[PDB]
Write a protein that binds this ligand. Structure first.
Ligand SMILES: [Mg+2]
Ligand SMILES: [Mg+2]
Ligand SMILES: [Mg+2]
Ligand SMILES: [Mg+2]
Ligand SMILES: [Mg+2]
Ligand SMILES: [Mg+2]
Ligand SMILES: [Mg+2]
Ligand SMILES: [Mg+2]
Ligand SMILES: [Mg+2]
Ligand SMILES: [Mg+2]
Ligand SMILES: [Mg+2]
Ligand SMILES: [Mg+2]
Ligand SMILES: [Mg+2]
Ligand SMILES: [Mg+2]
Ligand SMILES: [Mg+2]
Ligand SMILES: [Mg+2]
Ligand SMILES: [Mg+2]
Ligand SMILES: [Mg+2]
Ligand SMILES: [Mg+2]
Ligand SMILES: [Mg+2]
Ligand SMILES: [Mg+2]
Lengths: 141, 63, 206, 67, 100, 82, 143, 56, 145
RNA sequence: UAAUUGCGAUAACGAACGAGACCUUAACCUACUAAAUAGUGGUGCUAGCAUUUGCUGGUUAUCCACUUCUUAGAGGGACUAUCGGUUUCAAGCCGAUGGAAGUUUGAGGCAAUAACAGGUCUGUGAUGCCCUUAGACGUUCUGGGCCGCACGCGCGCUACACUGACGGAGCCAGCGAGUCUAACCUUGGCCGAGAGGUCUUGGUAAUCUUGUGAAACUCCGUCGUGCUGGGGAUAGAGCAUUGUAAUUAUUGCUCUUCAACGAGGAAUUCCUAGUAAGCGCAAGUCAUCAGCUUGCGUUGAUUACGUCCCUGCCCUUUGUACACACC
């Protein structure tokens, strides 16, 4: 009966599913430490869940993330949603509630996306234009 | 180069052939209780401070 | 602050910049107060962000565009002129290289220098075709504070774009001397020269 | 647009005329009456029926509504 | 024995009847079954210019038709498989039975 | 070709190709008082070329005179050290 | 303590492992090394032109050690890129398979990758540790 | 030996050919539609018309 | 790494194969001024003679120059794969040639005039001057002279 | 209000169509309903780092348990809900809150009366009339042509360089397709510089090609403001594949050759969030061939929320010498 829980985050078409369980606290990106995302700029954008509330809250729990689909910046956003929710989910029904709610204001105050994901999806293209909204061009002679 | 500071109190409406210029009545920050109307290009909310290179020119009322 | 040991090695430098205060990459977003009024509450300060890569849902409405940081605004104007439209990976990277330059020249805070330049560059007078009919010409009006930062940031980023075009000085450095000149003023800045030209032209139309 | 149509004005008006000693000023309770007290072909209409019902039931609280 | 059932009709409301009718038969017969698994609706698209001619505004509308597939696993002796393969027949509904 | 365009020429810059002692001693006595040196900085500065600048920063840092702060490709940011 | 190839970054690992073959220098030479274009989409060969048979093995083995089985056809789609076919738009073009086929053959006799069921090339008993032992000091190189 | 994708497309082909047959040959018999039912080892076709005794 | 200070062996534009090959540009791209040698042909010969490609052409020992040319003049003799060249089994003897500074325009004219006496379709179109590659000509090539 | 969308005097009583409602599609459900054709955790066998409890893996007749993520059916879920201002103060938006979802939530389908002498008799065995009907305007066969080239336009593609070009590395999508009495998609081994060929295998398909390892991309490099490693039009030579047959080169591969173009004038087009714009993939055409289209996913801006200036659109008043109606 190993204590564990699993939740997911997403982006435009990416879907990350982090596994949140009690442990030493090692973090993996599909096999590897979270220090190896390698856009080399988005690294603190995915370090946001770890560092905004501190690593003491992540000290007693380890997280393993599996990321599929989306683009390169999309997969990074996928990891941050699941990690943010996973700490919230773990602290809701294993840790006391008063930790969970104070974590919610820790996340939703700084960046709204961490717990509530975007409501924006690609739009179908239409005949009469190359993309969804633009037309080809027009010529009258 | 004296630049005047005035604060919007109300947004009158849009003005121009294509309505690109908004109508505004402002109150002077210093020497208050004086109101003037200025034609502003961009978007203006309330409680927004304006800066001018000229003070005694009221915009022509559209009426 | 205290170091934390863990199974996977997390280096010490990353930990420090978030415990004592939630910083930028390596710089600070506090004590960046705007000296000139009529721009505060339109230049977004007092909520730092780590990295300028963020997709904020800000597009349904008319006046919530004073809440996203000025830093990411400046990044989002680097992506323009065709071949580099989009590609925010390099827009962030270029600004990463730029802030290294204002750190070493003009030793003031690089965030402070950028914000000071924006206020000093936004024109406060512009022209508009107004008349009682066919007899219409240039007319002088005032620029709104929200349009000021719009007008200001446009000239700053396009100066580096045009100057680094057909010239060896890269976009990461050509944007530096523009900010350096835009903040204090030398009239050799691309943006400042455009500013005074635009204001004088509008002034002549009184 | 958020101006309700005749099929929402008339179905709602038919309810207060007949279900006054009945379903109250709270929407989520009203919509759980309409789904069985009336045969409505679409959920979106039923949701708009109990919507304009609550709006009219909130009017009848303070004074009467003419019509 | 490991008999497997498959349903590939284009009408869910007609096809869900056959799947419901076959799962209840084994359940009331007290035989272990593998529940009805519903495959994604594979989409056959045909897109054409509406006009028979080549003139006018280039309107391109699509005609779509959807294929709904179901398959169920059973383990039943020979005596009862014969009487269940010849029942639960519906128009426009295709069923194939494979043993092992 | 129907223009009214002038298509003016350029300055035809004469940036050096390879280093020499008359300039090698010049760089090591001129890299001070430069609070920022880079490949494009050392172009409007001492006339070494684009490849000369890149190899110079590779050399003047191998032994080391001033502290370097960036190793990212296509943009080198250096600064003098105390 | 424990050292894994996934515990080190990709760029430094392949760069360090590539040197080890150069130091050891016994595996093979195709015979036409440095004459081959290495793809049909790259309009110029390896610019350094010192390796591409000791440094390609550094990056292909990392994938083969990572995943279950990879064949030569998979590399062509993997290492390939858009080919600028002149005035035409870009298009994905595979890579030269002969070097991909023959680099794996050298890996056979050096005990890194051997024949595997269900087709393809899979790492051998000596293969797993050799990569990890080499990747070990790439972590202790900091001291 | 056919893909299930092709089968149901060719299934609709069978109906369209049958429909155009049963409207051209039974035109004066009050033909009003057709539908095909598939059974193992047996195929059914229902010709729905008005003058059934004339159809037969 | 280490940078060579200076030496007196540096020379400006030099002469070989009737072409004044420029200095101060790498020998892999300096030898693309001569016709018959492209971006690749220079790359192949410079390494087959054991010449430092990184080393420029302005500083290049004289004895290393003529080592290059005999490799360029007779590539097949010096273990080339032999499909690099632009004239193989050319038209006359089956020997593998590669046109160079003088013979690139000489053999082009011979290839030009090979099909004119034959009265081929390609030869006539070259004499006519239009596109011999079978392109549409209704709209392309209006400012051809 | 987007909407004769709603609503209250008052010579009108209701209705029908349109819009809307509806159908499809898009995102939420850790609650209902199941799954080695999808997965996850654990136990067996086993590989590596360490050896100390851990980490990264593989395994089909080794099972066990479960359905967050993926598929689904029936459903639930939003109706602008809660609150302050506005107008015989008669109902939404603003301001904020809630939430996955608050521009009818986004986008499509459907889409009225009446007309155009709009296009179409080259889709039809759908047709009237006219023509023709045996050296036939019927059919078929051989070789050409539709491509032809002084020039003028249209829809477009590649670009004029360091926000770069090129080289080694990291490396991520969804929409779909696919052979039977046929020869389709083909992984894997081998050969080949490449193209491509060769020998088996898998697949009638969530099990196989496919995670379609797309590209734009990110790291290390080389280059360095030179019409230069930008740009690759033109040409010359050779090797292959499709096709009975490619010569006015089908297309692919290899080397050489290297033009304009230095950001383009009057003019003119489209466009308001995952939208423009940039990037590529699939399918339709396909024995061979995209620079087309129809879709899909990827990165993701600036500027408004406006007005009647232009060009159009809708309703009312007024004038009319107009009615095939301002051409
Ligand atoms: Mg697009
Ligand atoms: Mg430039
Ligand atoms: Mg690549
Ligand atoms: Mg492109
Ligand atoms: Mg096992
Ligand atoms: Mg209210
Ligand atoms: Mg709609
Ligand atoms: Mg017709
Ligand atoms: Mg005929
Ligand atoms: Mg034609
Ligand atoms: Mg068109
Ligand atoms: Mg690249
Ligand atoms: Mg996919
Ligand atoms: Mg090129
Ligand atoms: Mg227009
Ligand atoms: Mg296709
Ligand atoms: Mg609008
Ligand atoms: Mg009159
Ligand atoms: Mg009159
Ligand atoms: Mg008349
Ligand atoms: Mg007139």
């Amino acid at each position: 009966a190993v204590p564990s829980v699993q939740t997911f985050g997403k982006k435009k078409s990416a879907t990350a599913v982090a596994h949140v369980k009690a442990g030493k606290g090692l973090i993996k990106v599909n096999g590897s430490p979270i220090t190896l995302v390698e856009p080399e700029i988005l690294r603190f954008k995915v370090y946001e869940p770890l560092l905004l509330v501190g690593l003491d809250k992540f000290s007693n729990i380890d997280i393993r993330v599996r990321v599929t689909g989306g683009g390169h910046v999309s997969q990074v956003y996928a990891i941050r949603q699941a990690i943010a929710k996973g700490l919230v989910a773990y602290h809701q029904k294993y840790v006391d509630e008063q930790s969970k709610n104070e974590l919610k204001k820790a996340f939703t105050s700084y960046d709204r996306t961490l717990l509530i994901a975007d409501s924006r999806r690609p739009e179908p293209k239409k005949f009469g234009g190359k993309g969804a909204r633009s037309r080809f061009q027009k010529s009258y002679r | 180069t004296p630049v005047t500071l005035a604060k919007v109190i109300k947004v009158l409406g849009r003005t121009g052939s294509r309505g690109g210029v908004t109508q505004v009545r402002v109150e002077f920050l210093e020497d208050t209780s004086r109101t003037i109307v200025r034609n502003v290009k961009g978007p203006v909310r309330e409680n927004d401070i304006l800066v001018l290179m000229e003070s005694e020119r009221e915009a022509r009322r559209l009426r | 602050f205290t170091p934390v040991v863990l199974a996977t090695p997390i280096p010490e430098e990353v930990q420090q910049a978030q415990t004592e205060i939630k910083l930028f990459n390596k710089w600070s977003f506090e004590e960046v107060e705007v000296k000139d009024a009529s721009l505060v509450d339109y230049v977004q300060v007092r909520q730092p962000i780590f990295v300028a890569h963020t997709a904020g849902r800000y597009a349904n409405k008319r006046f919530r565009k004073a809440q996203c940081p000025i830093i990411e605004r400046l990044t989002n104007s680097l992506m323009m002129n065709g071949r580099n439209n989009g590609k925010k990976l390099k827009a962030v990277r270029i600004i990463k290289h730029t802030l290294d330059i204002i750190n070493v020249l003009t030793d003031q805070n690089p965030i402070q220098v950028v914000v000071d330049a924006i206020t000093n560059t936004g024109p406060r007078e512009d022209t508009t075709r107004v008349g009682g009919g066919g007899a219409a010409r240039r007319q002088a009006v005032d620029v709104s504070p929200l349009r000021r930062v719009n007008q200001a940031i446009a000239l700053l980023t396009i100066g580096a774009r045009e100057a680094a075009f057909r010239n060896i000085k890269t976009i990461a450095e050509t944007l530096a001397e523009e900010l350096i000149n835009a903040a204090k003023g030398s009239s050799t800045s691309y943006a400042i020269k455009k500013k005074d030209e635009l204001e004088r032209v509008a002034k002549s139309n009184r | 647009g958020r101006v309700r149509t005749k099929t929402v004005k008339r179905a709602s008006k038919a309810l207060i005329e007949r279900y006054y000693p009945k379903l109250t000023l709270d929407f989520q309770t009203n919509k759980r009456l309409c789904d069985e007290i009336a045969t409505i072909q679409s959920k979106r209409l039923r949701n708009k029926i109990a919507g304009y019902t609550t709006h009219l039931m909130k009017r009848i609280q303070k004074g009467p509504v003419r019509g | 024995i490991k008999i497997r059932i498959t349903l590939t009709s284009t009408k869910v409301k007609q096809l869900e009847n056959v799947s419901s009718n076959i799962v209840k038969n084994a359940e009331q017969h007290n035989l272990v079954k593998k529940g009805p698994v519903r495959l994604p609706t594979k989409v056959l698209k045909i897109s054409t210019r509406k006009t028979p001619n080549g003139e006018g505004s280039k309107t391109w509308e699509t005609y779509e038709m959807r294929i709904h597939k179901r398959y169920i696993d059973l383990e039943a002796p020979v005596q009862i498989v014969k009487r269940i393969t010849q029942i639960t027949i519906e128009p426009g509904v295709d069923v194939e039975v494979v043993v092992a | 070709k129907k223009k009214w365009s002038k298509k003016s020429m350029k300055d035809r810059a004469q940036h050096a190709v390879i280093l020499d002692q008359e300039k090698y001693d010049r760089i090591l006595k001129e890299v001070p008082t430069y609070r920022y040196v880079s490949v494009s900085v050392l172009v409007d500065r001492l006339k070494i070329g684009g490849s000369l600048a890149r190899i110079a920063l590779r050399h003047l840092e191998k032994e080391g005179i001033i502290k370097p702060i960036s190793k990212h490709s296509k943009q080198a940011i250096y600064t003098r050290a105390t | 303590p424990g050292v894994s190839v996934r515990d080190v970054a990709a760029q430094d690992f392949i760069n360090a492992y590539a040197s080890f073959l150069q130091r050891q220098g016994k595996l093979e030479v195709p015979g036409y090394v440095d004459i081959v274009k290495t793809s049909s989409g790259n309009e110029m060969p390896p610019q350094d032109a010192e390796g591409w048979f000791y440094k390609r093995a550094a990056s292909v083995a990392r994938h083969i050690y990572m995943r279950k089985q990879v064949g030569v056809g998979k590399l062509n789609k993997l290492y390939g890129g858009a080919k600028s076919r002149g005035v035409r738009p870009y298009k994905h073009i595979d890579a030269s398979g002969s070097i991909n086929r023959k680099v794996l053959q050298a890996l056979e006799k050096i005990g890194i990758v051997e024949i595997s069921p269900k087709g393809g090339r899979r790492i051998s008993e000596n293969g797993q540790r050799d990569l990890d032992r080499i990747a070990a000091q790439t972590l202790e190189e900091d001291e | 030996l056919i893909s299930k994708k092709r089968k149901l497309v060719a299934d609709g082909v069978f109906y369209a050919e049958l429909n155009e047959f049963f409207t051209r040959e039974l035109a004066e018999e009050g033909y009003s539609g057709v539908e095909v039912r598939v059974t193992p080892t047996k195929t059914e076709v229902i010709i729905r018309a008005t003058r059934t005794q004339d159809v037969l | 790494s280490l940078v060579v200070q200076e030496q007196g062996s540096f020379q400006h534009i030099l002469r070989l194969l009737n072409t004044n090959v420029d200095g101060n540009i790498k020998i892999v791209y300096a030898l693309t001024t001569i016709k018959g040698v492209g971006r690749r042909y220079s790359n192949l010969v410079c390494k087959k003679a054991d010449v430092d490609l990184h080393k420029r052409a302005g500083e290049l020992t004289q004895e290393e120059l003529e080592r290059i040319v005999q490799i360029m003049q007779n590539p097949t003799h010096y273990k080339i794969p032999a499909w690099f060249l632009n004239r193989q089994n050319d038209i006359t003897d089956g020997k593998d040639y590669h046109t160079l500074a003088n013979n690139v325009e000489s053999k082009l004219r011979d290839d030009l005039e090979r099909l004119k006496k034959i009265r081929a379709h390609r030869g006539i179109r070259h004499f006519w001057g239009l596109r011999v590659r079978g392109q549409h000509t209704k709209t392309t090539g209006r400012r051809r002279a």
